[PDB]
């Protein structure tokens, strides 16, 4: 109930929202049907349009007009945005040459440069180039300011998840807005685009920028605009708020455009009908910039132009129907479209089995345009699992397709030619970023980055301390002229032990054997030196990783590799080795096929054993440093140490063996050497964070050997590939992955073929940031380089995506 008989006289677009049953006059009142009777008349004036003409110049202030061309308008803060151009001979902001903004040039009483965030729905990255002829204002921002060639959204590449990620710095799993449609079983409530449940605060986790600002005494313009408030009126309201007195005037502002998303759904991303909406967005940008120029704020304000996601070509005929796979299609609820989420239609059905649903959707058709996953098997880079609102069964839908339950859902609801929501690595889903202003750099291109990073920068731009988030603070310091945040490396928590030879062979009863009983003072001092770390500068190029939690571990040196060996998990946390361009692949000799050797530096009680592998019929084992890459026949014995062994399902050893025997050498040839750090990951509760021992759900049978959920590798080399990896003077180049440790290869539909046809493609799917691996292992990499820490942070957030240009 709203007593709508109050008035908006003097309160038009008021900043503090008032409580029912008092009537509202803020930019959201329309959307709650709560505006006062006179809101349209007083607050949404339209008379005479939005531009001065010559004949309006000097006019008598007529308060009915949408904007004013009268003499008092500048001092009232309510001129049309083109007033000075038409009536005072000034030029449009876009026609002025760009001039570096070295310091904020602000009017007296401005405490900090204001921030204006101009967000554009569905603005695909390639629009910057392909639409450049029709967006002169946007192109000036882009070329004069700081820009990325594109910005990576979060998954799913839907609107609300990405707008709220931009607001919070959080993955959707952590902020709670996991799609445009949702069911929360604890609430027993649903969230939709249409309707009222989406306004309830309990959906929205974390701390968005407007609340961060408020709590720390920075005033925020209300970020959200009701759909019917036209764009021109949104701009004028921002400009009016910027004329408020110092103690009332906000420091941060937001404008949101429904375009070009709205048209892109109807016409596809490059439909001829798309030229106009791009023109209109640019015209709005021009109005804002002309308006800031009138207020002498155009070399004072920082302006961000940012998109939520891109747009892809998608039509109704590219729909896969679950009715062509499942017989039981009535006992499921599907959240449909560019992603799929499945749950039971009824929680009273004890006959519902996710296992059989998944199998019925797995590699059933040769061209199948979706792939089912249990949510915990999704590529860890998506960070799309740790929320009760995300259903256990997920479908990753191929770009250009939809998934639906039954054909009747498509025709009883072709309309659309564009959509989005796909895997956030897909080129068509990439979006834009431009930063223009005194605090951003001048004419600078930066590398692509993820939108999770921007909350920290927006906090930096306003002098705010960010709430805890998924950004890596410092990783975008290179966008900014000043206001940089100076991070420091986290402190190592556990220091390693450096064990020498402490145990005799006969003290071990591991059930292992090796054909190694084969025996010289020249090469005896030499192996001694290798076991004390003589080659360590070769194999450990960036310092040892730091262990950021409390644990017990040992550094083990070898001729060809170095490891940090966990006495708690009975395996390495990490294994580091360097493979030069020249290095040779050999095979495992026949006599050493089943060889596993006790490590005389590590007690029997902190060692794995071969008997457990024999008795475990499901579980086999592999090595972290590959025997294939040993530098000499004698060095190869080191690779068979029980301390280099890790548990591996036979299905996964196919993947791993191919990576180690073929791919590492190929990368070394292509990149002119590589340094590899490999190791295990344990994430049984799928939270993206290192498990403690008491979270492990699976051990090798009859033992305390925990089973990893994943294996990682980080593969580093010189960015200037004319320098070899082990003597690189400048910036580095990295690619990494987090491979799921699975007992079958059901994920890979071509897995009955030779590994050359499917393994590398699996690895590409599970590409990862070093930072993802840091969270999952509690390690901190690249501790000792010649590079600045900010550049390292940027490197640690890099994702190798394997898309073309
Ligand atoms: C991305 O960045 C984010 C933000 O930094 C990272 O997420 C943080 O990670 C922390 C570790 O998981 C986590 O810390 C825990 O928080 C508990 C208190 O949390 C409440 O308060 C905060 C602060 O205001 C608030 O933000 C939280 O909001 C969550 O929950 C509501 C829904 O109720 C949502 O609105 C919101 O979206 C958010 O949901 C998300 O997080 C929760 C977990 O909090 C998930 O379950 C959801 O799926 C969703 O993703 C909360 O309101 C605190 O109680 C925890 O302490 C327990 O564990 C410690 C271990 O040290 C132990 O010492 C304690 O005893 C305690 O255990 C007790 O509870 C157990 C569980 O019931 C029980 O089994 C025990 O026996 C004990 O009784 C802990 O400190 C922090 O909350 C989140 N923050 C956010 C915003 O999500 C995230 O990790 C990053 N991602 C990556 C990959 O790096
Ligand atoms: N077809 S589709 O794209 O699948 C579609 F169906 C999706 C729905 N839809 C709409 O019709 N809506 C959607 C929106 C409006 C007006 N809105 C805002 O006003 C707004 C804006 C903002 O900005 C947050 C800023 C944080 C700092 O960084 C910049 C972004 N946040 C938010 C919320 C996160 C807090 C909202 C969203 C109409 C039609 C299109
Ligand atoms: Ca959107
Ligand atoms: Ca975990
Ligand atoms: Cl969705
Ligand atoms: K076995
Ligand atoms: Na298969
Ligand atoms: Zn859309």
From Swiss-Prot:
Keywords: Calcium, Chemotaxis, Cleavage on pair of basic residues, Disulfide bond, Glycoprotein, Hydrolase, Lipid degradation, Lipid metabolism, Metal-binding, Obesity, Repeat, Secreted, Signal, Zinc. GO terms for molecular function: alkylglycerophosphoethanolamine phosphodiesterase activity; calcium ion binding; lysophospholipase activity; nucleic acid binding; phosphodiesterase I activity; phospholipase D activity; polysaccharide binding; scavenger receptor activity. Its cofactor is Zn(2+); Ca(2+). Zn(2+) 1 binds at residues 121, 159, 308-309. Its main location: secreted. Binds 2 Zn(2+) ions per subunit. A motif (Cell attachment site) lies at residues 76-78. Secreted lysophospholipase D that hydrolyzes lysophospholipids to produce the signaling molecule lysophosphatidic acid (LPA) in extracellular fluids. Its major substrate is lysophosphatidylcholine. Can also act on sphingosylphosphorylcholine producing sphingosine-1-phosphate, a modulator of cell motility. Can hydrolyze, in vitro, bis-pNPP, to some extent pNP-TMP, and barely ATP. Involved in several motility-related processes such as angiogenesis and neurite outgrowth. Acts as an angiogenic factor by stimulating migration of smooth muscle cells and microtubule formation. Residues 4-47, 48-92 form the SMB domain. Residues 94-447 are annotated as: Phosphodiesterase. The keyword Ubl conjugation does not apply. Zn(2+) 2 binds at residues 261, 265, 420. Residues 541-805 are annotated as: Nuclease-like domain. N-glycosylation, but not furin-cleavage, plays a critical role on secretion and on lysoPLD activity. The interdomain disulfide bond between Cys-363 and Cys-749 is essential for catalytic activity. The gene is Enpp2. This is Autotaxin. GO terms for biological process: cell chemotaxis; cellular response to cadmium ion; cellular response to estradiol stimulus; estrous cycle; immune response; negative regulation of cell-matrix adhesion; phosphatidylcholine catabolic process; phospholipid catabolic process.
């Amino acid at each position: 109930w709203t007593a709508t008989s109050g008035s908006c006289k003097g309160r038009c677009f008021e900043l503090q929202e008032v409580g029912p049953p008092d009537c509202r006059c803020d930019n959201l009142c329309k959307s709650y049907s709560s505006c006062c009777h006179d809101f349209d008349e007083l607050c949404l004036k339209t008379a005479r349009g939005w531009e001065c003409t010559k004949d309006r110049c000097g006019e008598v202030r007529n308060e009915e007009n949408a904007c004013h061309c009268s003499e008092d308008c500048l001092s009232r803060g309510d001129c049309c945005t083109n007033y000075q151009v038409v009536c005072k001979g000034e030029s449009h902001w876009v026609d002025d040459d760009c001039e570096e903004i070295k310091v904020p040039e602000c009017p007296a009483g401005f405490v900090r440069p204001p921030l204006i965030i101009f967000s554009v729905d569905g603005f695909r990255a390639s629009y910057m180039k392909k639409g450049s002829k029709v967006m002169p204002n946007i192109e000036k921002l882009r070329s004069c300011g700081t820009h990325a060639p594109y910005m990576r959204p979060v998954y799913p590449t839907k609107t609300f998840p990405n707008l709220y990620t931009l607001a919070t710095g959080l993955y959707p799993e952590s902020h709670g807005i996991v799609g445009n449609s949702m069911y929360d079983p604890v609430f027993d409530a649903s969230f939709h685009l249409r309707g009222r449940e989406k306004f309830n605060h309990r959906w929205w986790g974390g701390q968005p920028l407007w609340i961060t600002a408020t709590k720390q005494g920075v005033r925020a313009g209300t970020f959200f605009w009701s759909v019917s408030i036209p764009h021109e009126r949104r701009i004028l309201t921002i400009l009016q708020w910027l004329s408020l007195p110092d103690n009332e005037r906000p420091s941060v502002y937001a404008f949101y455009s429904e375009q070009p998303d709205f048209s892109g759904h109807k016409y596809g991303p490059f439909g001829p009908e798309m030229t106009n909406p791009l023109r209109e967005i640019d015209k709005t940008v021009g109005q804002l910039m002309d308006g800031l120029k009138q207020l002498r704020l155009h070399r004072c304000v920082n302006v961000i132009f940012v998109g939520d996601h891109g747009m892809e070509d998608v039509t109704c005929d590219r729909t896969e129907f679950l009715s062509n796979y499942l017989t039981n299609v009535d006992d499921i609820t599907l959240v449909p479209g560019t992603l799929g989420r499945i749950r039971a239609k009824s929680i009273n059905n004890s006959k519902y089995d996710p296992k059989t649903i998944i199998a019925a959707l797995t590699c059933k058709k040769p061209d199948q345009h979706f792939k089912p996953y249990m949510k915990q098997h999704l590529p860890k880079r998506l960070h799309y699992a740790n929320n009760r609102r995300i259903e256990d069964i997920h479908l990753l839908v191929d770009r250009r397709w939809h998934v639906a339950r039954k054909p009747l859902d498509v025709y009883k609801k072709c309309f659309f030619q564009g959509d989005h929501g796909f895997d956030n690595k897909v080129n068509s889903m990439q979006t834009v970023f431009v930063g223009y202003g005194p605090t951003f750099k001048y004419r600078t291109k930066v590398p692509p980055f993820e939108n999770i990073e921007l909350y920290n920068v927006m906090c930096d731009l306003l002098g705010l301390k960010p709430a805890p988030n998924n950004g890596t603070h410092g990783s975008l310091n290179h966008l900014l002229r000043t206001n940089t945040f100076r991070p420091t490396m986290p402190d190592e928590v556990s220091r390693p032990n450096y064990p020498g030879i402490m145990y005799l062979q006969s003290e071990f009863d591991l059930g292992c054997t090796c054909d190694d009983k084969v025996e010289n003072k020249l090469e005896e001092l030499n192996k001694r030196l290798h076991t004390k770390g003589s080659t360590k500068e070769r194999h450990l190029l960036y310092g040892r990783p730091a262990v950021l939690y409390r644990t017990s571990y040992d550094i083990l040196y070898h001729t060809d590799f170095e490891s940090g060996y966990s006495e708690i998990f009975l395996m390495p946390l990490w294994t580091s080795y360097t493979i030069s361009k020249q290095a040779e692949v050999s095979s495992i000799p026949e006599h050493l096929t089943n060889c596993v050797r006790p490590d005389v530096r590590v007690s029997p009680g902190f060692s794995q054993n071969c008997l457990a592998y024999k008795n475990d019929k499901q579980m086999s084992y592999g090595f972290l440093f590959p025997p294939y890459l040993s530098s000499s026949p004698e060095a190869k014995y080191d690779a068979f140490l029980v301390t280099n062994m890790v548990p591996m399902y036979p299905a996964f050893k196919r993947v791993w063996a191919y990576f180690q025997r073929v791919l590492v050498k190929k990368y070394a040839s292509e990149r002119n050497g590589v340094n590899v750090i490999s190791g295990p990951i344990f994430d049984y509760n799928y939270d993206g964070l290192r498990d403690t021992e008491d979270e492990i759900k699976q051990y090798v049978e009859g033992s305390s050997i925990p089973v990893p959920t994943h294996y990682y590798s980080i593969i580093t080399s010189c960015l200037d590939f004319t320098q070899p990896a082990d003597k690189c003077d400048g910036p580095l180049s990295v690619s990494s992955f987090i491979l799921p440790h699975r007992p079958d290869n059901d994920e890979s539909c071509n897995s009955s073929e030779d590994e050359s046809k499917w393994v590398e493609e699996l690895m590409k799917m599970h590409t990862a940031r070093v930072r993802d691996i840091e969270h999952l292992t509690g390690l901190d990499f690249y501790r000792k380089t010649s590079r600045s820490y900010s550049e390292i942070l940027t490197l640690k957030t890099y994702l190798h995506t394997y898309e073309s240009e």
